[PDB]
Scaffold this active site. Structure first.
Site, PDB file in Angstrom:
ATOM      1  CD  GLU A   1      29.401 -24.763 -51.107  1.00 20.25           C
ATOM      2  OE1 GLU A   1      30.065 -25.836 -51.151  1.00 20.25           O
ATOM      3  OE2 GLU A   1      29.900 -23.692 -50.687  1.00 20.25           O
TER       4      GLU A   1
ATOM      5  CG  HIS B   1      32.997 -22.014 -50.186  1.00 18.62           C
ATOM      6  ND1 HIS B   1      32.419 -23.139 -50.736  1.00 18.62           N
ATOM      7  CD2 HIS B   1      34.267 -22.374 -49.841  1.00 18.62           C
ATOM      8  CE1 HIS B   1      33.286 -24.136 -50.727  1.00 18.62           C
ATOM      9  NE2 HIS B   1      34.421 -23.711 -50.188  1.00 18.62           N
TER      10      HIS B   1
END
Ligand SMILES: CC(C)(COP(=O)(O)OP(=O)(O)OC[C@H]1O[C@@H](n2cnc3c(N)ncnc32)[C@H](O)[C@@H]1OP(=O)(O)O)[C@@H](O)C(=O)NCCC(=O)NCCS
Ligand SMILES: CC(C)(COP(=O)(O)OP(=O)(O)OC[C@H]1O[C@@H](n2cnc3c(N)ncnc32)[C@H](O)[C@@H]1OP(=O)(O)O)[C@@H](O)C(=O)NCCC(=O)NCCS
Lengths: 388, 287, 388, 287
Positions: B208, B246
């Protein structure tokens, strides 16, 4: 978590770092009164917003009369400042920093971040102060000097000198630079900072190093042991929905589009957004449910997502988690009824009772399609906004 | 398979806590050889039919566990991980989310010097389908197989897990390295382990935005990975300089965008797929 | 550098460690007045000297009347306390520590040193409190628990708990022990301690951990960055000749014998002493000239060495250094004349002009033999005291 | 010879200071390839005909020196040593006396991880007679030869040097590891180097009270040193718990007395000599 320039400067003060004489004022009256406390003009008045580029947006001015300080404070207090680093909505100006004018001889850059590639706090210094550091990194990489803090020893003076000598500083400026490095590195470690940026770190005509600006970023994950920083949080500087979502254990980040996304998992959230994108969609937000998708949580999610007018459909992508797929469906149903969701809602459900929860959604009557798989889910939410 | 197998003896730190209890029950039900737990203050008791120790060292002496799963709240993780490292545990799976970056910075330096392997933090765990399950992942979607998966995301891994089970490829081992900026283990670390693992025939690498682990992993793959790798990066539509859930999912300094990682992976010869729904398809292709 | 118990306890206080309520008094009047400030008796009165074994020498008593505190202070203030850890001359009692009586339930030991073998600060804990820790190490090694501070991370709470659980502590005592460990380890690192010894670390009847005693040793090499500790030095606790020698850049350590040794180099000094020993001699001192043996330095050396009556000969062993052998001889000559050295002086000289300096010594007339080699030098100084 | 030779390129930190100047002049006169010095603030100047740099890194880039001798006052040594380590210097000889034990504790951990060798602090230096001289030792008493010497004491080493020159044995290399409690290098480190050095035929190991480096070195010698070793320990007549000059010369906890070391050395088969005057004789014997 970001701090205001005035706050960063208080902190610098606390660590014996040099910063202009200044006061954060909340009324035009305090602001004009701060002039005399400062001394002879002219004075620098700066709106205090977390974003940068305040200069190019008129939020920073060097005035030379109290009557001017006042006019400036009057113009900005309570108004929102829009810079290239804020959304079109800007950030509220609740403080005007009034500082002494500084005699700039040269402008340096000194900053630090956690470098993920080298897994160290890394200080960066450049003679290219006053400029966006990224730009200098792009174009004149050889002008950016770096040192990595050794976790085993803490910041060392030779690292400060290394940078000082690479900046071509000399004489007392080297000792001064070293002090600033040692303290900024100490602050970085002790306050659990995520980022420090002094731009510009100025050499004054009188030949002294001074922090003309300051931008501190704290590690949110460390706030539990940073009570001082904890109190410094200025919620008004961010979309309120973010803090709102956080109390609810939701991660919200507003975007531009009109397809609301509700997903459990940050990775799945981003991936979901991207799939809606791939399928011609336009994601309105990132909202990661992540914490057990209880019925109330979903309700909150919806309130937060739909609190944005641009939202013309909501995609719910839930893969697993703690609650079973049928209980999740009830909560979606309950949230859609209660919150009075007036938009189509597409739901992708995976896990125990995925189908039973799909059935429950179909039998609700509510405008909630139960998608059969992710690609489908996307196409359906995309389709569901066509025209709307 | 890598990291764990039917023989891995695991202890759980924060064993008597909610998540420690709940997820150990799941581990136990799956057959993971959980052999005990650590909760300072409850040594000498039993929980889930296993012994509870006050320290990891008492637990290791007692059980010979070589792996520890940590379910300790963030404020005490550094302490926990460091205690495990010091007790000789060779593998630490840290589920905990919210560990200060500066703590992981130190821990990571320690992990490396002590030669201890840590998967996490802020990770879902590790599972070798059919043999061992450590973590919070749902065991029923896995299928013993030939595809090794590494990901910075929990949920996205499940999507890839589902796909590889539904194409009948199965999974050799799934490693969720977590979403924090300084993980204990990174793509290159895990990738190397899949390359050297006979049971793993293909690899799914899920990343990501943020950092450059993916770009470095690409460079590594071109040079040292021979098995086919399907890759997927999330965050193409993510704004820069905003944390996307995150702690590590954040484009800092305009570096580390999804496109950069995609391109870097493509250049290294990795089979990238734009939609996470086509991971299975892409595997079929290079399989 | 050693601190007094009262000083260690102030320090412990400063770090939130628990120690009895007490005051260091310098007059019987202050001492008796401290009783009421403390509260209900009985009170513990302790002479403050750096040495231990104060108890077995009567310097620690639990009295129950102010009139007693007074008598005790009167008996000791200005007097010298001799313990098994001091020379026969004892250490001056200039402070009497008056503290609250403590209700001892159990006595533990907690201490730390730099372990040279493992190159770490190591904390040591034992249930064998109140006992000489060496004795416990000798006899019940399995009762001593240790942890090594990791230089990369600093002291960690699990290490404190490790020790706590090995001491069989439980309940709140574990948290309390951990706090004490964390702080003692923090003090150790921050004040550059060389040694910490809490003997006994007590569990009180009320079930709390308390530092009944405290013995801190600072790293002398770090005093330049420990201003607080620097001021705490109590010179009266050591042979004054030591500090005296130090200002002169000499390392002096008084011994029992009658053969004074003056040597450059600590290693050569010890070795010289040993050779004088091997050859039937009895070294009166260790004195390492180490800093350039200028004439004045040697003069100082002699004054310090001879300030001990037992000295009946002085061996000077100089191998190399910064000054040439003849200049060294002149200084010895000059020092022997001036200081009016009334004892035989044997000199071993090696280096440039060794012989020319030997000649200069022989031609002085003064009672200064120039030895020809080290073994010789020894035999001659030994011989030179025979009878004297 | 070990550590240094005719080819060792040395730079000096604290080069323009009294001792740095004086002792570099001696090094230069002996033929040591001094190639430069570092004194923050005087970069760009010349001294003793060598270039002076502001940092060790500028000095290494410029000269390729792989060794650095440090003459920096104690308060700045940690900084100096750490700067050298960071600049790639592979060998550091630190003459400085008075470095806080806690600083050397950290430095030592660093030296070991970075794979840098440090002789000192509080040491006289190193000399390979006839080839290279780094330190404060007097070069004229040495004689190129076959005896390697390691000692915790400067002056006692000279005595052994004198003796080995006067028996015509000469010295391969002399390593003064210094009198501090946590040295950068210890007897075992140096001993291993003498064992592997063809030019060194016998070894003189000089110790004193304190620590247990000698006892551990004995154990090591019994097991891995084959060349003959003559040993001498000073401090037989030293009181316990009193610092005898060198920071490390102190019997702490009644452990580390001269007799213990003597006995431990004797047991390991080392030829010990009670009088430092008989080191030469003892060598003749096992030579
Ligand atoms: C780790 C986490 C799950 C812990 O949550 P939790 O179980 O609700 O917390 P609890 O308080 O119930 O349990 C924690 C236990 O740790 C224990 N503990 C604290 N410090 C400890 C230590 N050093 N060693 C061992 N146990 C310790 C406590 O004793 C407590 O158990 P107790 O209730 O028996 O006293 C939570 O903090 C977290 O990080 N959640 C996010 C997980 C995640 O999202 N991961 C991403 C993968 S996609
Ligand atoms: C190391 C020691 C000799 C230095 O003493 P010194 O030369 O008189 O000290 P000086 O101040 O003259 O020189 C020190 C130099 O270090 C420099 N310096 C300081 N920090 C420095 C750094 N980080 N890097 C490089 N140089 C540094 C100073 O610039 C100074 O030189 P300058 O005069 O050009 O400014 C002394 O402190 C010492 O430890 N002596 C005992 C040595 C000993 O007994 N050894 C035992 C072997 S038996």
């Amino acid at each position: 978590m970001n701090l205001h320039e005035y706050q960063a400067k208080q902190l610098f003060a606390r660590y014996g770092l040099p910063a202009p004489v200044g006061y954060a004022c909340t009324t035009p009256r305090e602001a004009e009164e701060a002039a005399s406390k400062i001394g002879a003009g002219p004075w620098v008045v700066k709106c205090q917003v977390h974003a940068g580029g305040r200069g190019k947006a008129g939020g920073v001015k060097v005035v030379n009369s109290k009557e001017d300080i006042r006019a400036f404070a009057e113009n900005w207090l309570g108004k929102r400042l829009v810079t290239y680093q804020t959304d079109a909505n800007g950030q509220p100006v609740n403080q005007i920093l009034v500082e002494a004018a500084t005699d700039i001889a040269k402008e340096l850059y000194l900053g630090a971040v956690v470098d993920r590639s080298s897994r160290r706090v890394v200080f960066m210094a450049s003679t290219e102060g006053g400029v966006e550091i990224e730009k200098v990194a792009e174009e004149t990489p050889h002008l950016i000097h770096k040192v990595a803090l050794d976790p085993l020893t803490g910041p060392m003076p030779y690292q400060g000198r290394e940078l000082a000598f690479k900046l071509g500083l000399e004489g007392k400026l080297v000792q001064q630079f070293t002090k600033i490095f040692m303290g900024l590195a100490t602050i970085f470690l002790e306050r659990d900072l995520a980022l420090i940026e002094i731009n510009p770190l100025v050499i004054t005509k009188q030949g002294d190093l001074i922090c003309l600006d300051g931008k501190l970023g704290a590690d949110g994950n460390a706030l539990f042991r940073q009570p001082d920083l904890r109190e410094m949080r200025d919620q008004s500087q961010e979309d309120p929905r973010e803090a709102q979502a956080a109390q609810w254990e939701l991660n919200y980040v507003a975007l531009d589009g009109n397809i609301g996304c509700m997903v459990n998992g940050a990775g799945l959230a981003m991936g979901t957004m991207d799939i809606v994108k791939l399928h011609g969609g336009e994601p309105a937000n990132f909202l990661d449910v992540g914490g057990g998708a209880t019925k109330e949580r979903v309700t909150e999610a919806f309130k937060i997502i739909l609190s944005d007018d641009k939202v013309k459909a909501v995609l719910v992508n839930i893969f697993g988690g703690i609650v079973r797929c049928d209980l999740i469906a009830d909560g979606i149903i309950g949230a859609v009824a209660e919150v009075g969701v007036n938009v189509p809602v597409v739901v992708r459900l995976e896990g125990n009772n995925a189908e039973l929860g799909a059935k429950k959604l179909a039998d609700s009557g509510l405008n909630i399609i139960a998608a059969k798989g992710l690609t489908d889910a996307a196409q359906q939410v995309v389709a569901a906004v066509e025209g709307k | 398979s890598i990291l764990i197998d039917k023989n891995t003896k695991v202890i759980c730190q924060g064993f008597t806590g909610s998540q420690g209890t709940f997820h150990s029950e799941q581990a136990i039900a799956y057959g993971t050889k959980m052999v005990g737990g650590v909760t300072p203050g409850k040594g000498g008791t039993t929980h889930l039919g296993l012994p509870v120790f006050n320290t990891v060292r008492e637990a290791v002496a007692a059980t010979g566990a070589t792996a520890s799963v940590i379910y300790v709240p963030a404020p005490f993780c550094k302490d926990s991980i460091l205690e495990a490292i010091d007790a000789g545990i060779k593998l630490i799976i840290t589920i905990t989310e919210g560990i200060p970056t500066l703590d992981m910075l130190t821990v990571k330096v320690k992990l490396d010097e002590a030669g201890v392997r840590m998967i996490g933090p802020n990770a879902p765990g590790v599972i070798t389908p059919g043999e061992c399950k450590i973590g919070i992942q749902p065991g029923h979607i896995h299928k013993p197989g030939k595809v090794g998966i590494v990901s910075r995301s929990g949920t996205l891994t499940y999507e890839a897990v589902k796909q590889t089970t539904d194409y009948g490829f199965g999974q050799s081992t799934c490693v969720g390295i977590g979403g924090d900026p300084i993980p204990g283990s990174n793509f290159i670390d895990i990738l190397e382990m899949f390359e050297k693992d006979p049971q793993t025939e293909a690899i799914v690498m899920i990343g990501e935005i943020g950092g450059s682990a993916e770009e470095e992993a690409a460079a590594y793959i071109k040079e040292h990975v021979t098995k086919p790798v399907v890759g997927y990066i999330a965050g193409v539509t993510a704004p820069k300089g905003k944390r996307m859930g995150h702690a590590g999912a954040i484009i800092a300094g305009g570096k580390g965008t999804a496109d950069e990682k995609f391109a870097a992976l493509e250049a290294a010869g990795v089979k990238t797929v734009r939609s996470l729904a086509d991971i299975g398809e892409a595997l079929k292709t290079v399989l």
